[PDB]
Amino acid sequence: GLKAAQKTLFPLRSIDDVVRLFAAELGREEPDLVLLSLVLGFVEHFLAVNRVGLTYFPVADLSIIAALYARFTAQIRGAVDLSLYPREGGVSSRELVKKVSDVIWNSLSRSYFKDRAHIQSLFSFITGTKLDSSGVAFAVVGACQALGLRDVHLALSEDHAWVVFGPNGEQTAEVTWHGKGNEDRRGQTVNAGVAERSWLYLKGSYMRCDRKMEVAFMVCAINPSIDLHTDSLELLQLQQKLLWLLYDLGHLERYPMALGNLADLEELEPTPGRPDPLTLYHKGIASAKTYYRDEHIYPYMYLAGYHCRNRNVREALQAWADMATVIQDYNYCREDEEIYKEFFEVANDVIPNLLKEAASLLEAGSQGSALQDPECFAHLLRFYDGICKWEEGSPTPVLHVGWATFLVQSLGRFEGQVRQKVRIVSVPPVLTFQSEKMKGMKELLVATKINSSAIKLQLTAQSQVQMK
């Protein structure tokens, strides 16, 4: 049950009242994940899903929130008999974690769109019997906290969620699905995925949350979207204030994606007296380097996106090259398609559009153009090099001829005299290639008119030209 001290701030009449509740719960040894998710889901429902009747803020009455809370705890306590799963050493068993996962899973509506907005919270679970993938993982952790299972915690990659538990928190269990059309692995470890060096499991350099980081997860999970063209200003402000609360308390230190989210929010609407977006993006990169062996892609993606939006071509190219330098040490595996799509879109859409505008501006007499900067040409080359090296050793290939036309066009946006300045140096501006594909392509990179046909042959598996 909710404790008297958890009840005293209600009713919550404003954004700032919600923030005060989060501050009060974060001052406890176990912030109450169920309470906090239900509150966020309630206000997100009445600020983004149905704004009918809204005049300022959807007041959250204790009676309403307590009844939702009681529905959740009744449904978990009645379905999970702890006596069947004795806790050896004050830690949980795999069978207990599987049972909790089953209880959440089996509660969900039989058929619904899993990609929908606003199905992340326990409010969605109780009122609509709908959750998205990571929403199930979070709900399992919240259920385990409600049961007294202090060792069960959320684990997060850049594209998936599961749990850690057990002796020293060293066990892993799948508790939800990943993507669409993949085979369920609920109950199993993540060790096969770690051992195959897929992006999905980050080579083991994934987040292992404490309770405070689980609060940060639900705050990052707030979705201000009303429709394709409209966000709730109220929810953006709430999320931003909550992220700064977490930041000040130290709970974003090990959470690169939260730092990126906060930077994005500051770019939209800066908070006076706070660090700039750029500072925050760089903090997210530093966090990844410090705590995650520099094995995360999104810290660089977030930075590159900022530079791209600000048409800072040099800076954007540098950050995408840095992205590619991370991915090069992975193997491209069967459930890694989201990061393939990101690299494909950068190479084959975003970079081409950026360089097309840069070429028009150069024609109009721009100075200091990325297209006249050999260091920028080197960043483009390093981006392709890391993608080629990623492909090496991978069970599934990355490149194909549909990449080749965009490579030739992008290369060609730099005049030959600029391209000539980069010295490509071998182990055993200056650039070293890691990939064999780019090493073989070196020869082709300085001609006044690039040999398109030869580039295509070198980038792809094709080794012959047409017969006739």
Swiss-Prot record:
Effect noted on mutating A263P: In parathyroid tumor
Effect annotated for changing L265P: In MEN1; almost no effect on JUND-binding
Record annotation: effect of changing L246P: Found in isolated hyperparathyroidism; likely pathogenic
What, per the annotation, is the impact of changing P256H?
Found in isolated hyperparathyroidism; likely pathogenic
- Report the outcome of Y298A: Reduced interaction with KMT2A
Q: Which domain of life is it from?
A: Eukaryota
Effect annotated for changing Q239P: Found in isolated hyperparathyroidism; likely pathogenic
Result for mutant: V163E: Found in isolated hyperparathyroidism; likely pathogenic
UniProt-reported outcome of changing G284D: Found in isolated hyperparathyroidism; likely pathogenic
What is the recorded phenotype of mutating E345A? Reduced interaction with KMT2A
Region annotation (Interaction with FANCD2) ranges: 193-365
Which keywords does the record carry? Chromatin regulator, Disease variant, DNA-binding, Nucleus, Phosphoprotein, Repressor, Transcription, Transcription regulation
Effect in UniProt of substituting M257W: Loss of interaction with KMT2A and JUND
Name the chain's protein: Menin
Source organism of the structure: Homo sapiens
Lineage of the species this protein comes from? Eukaryota, Metazoa, Chordata, Craniata, Vertebrata
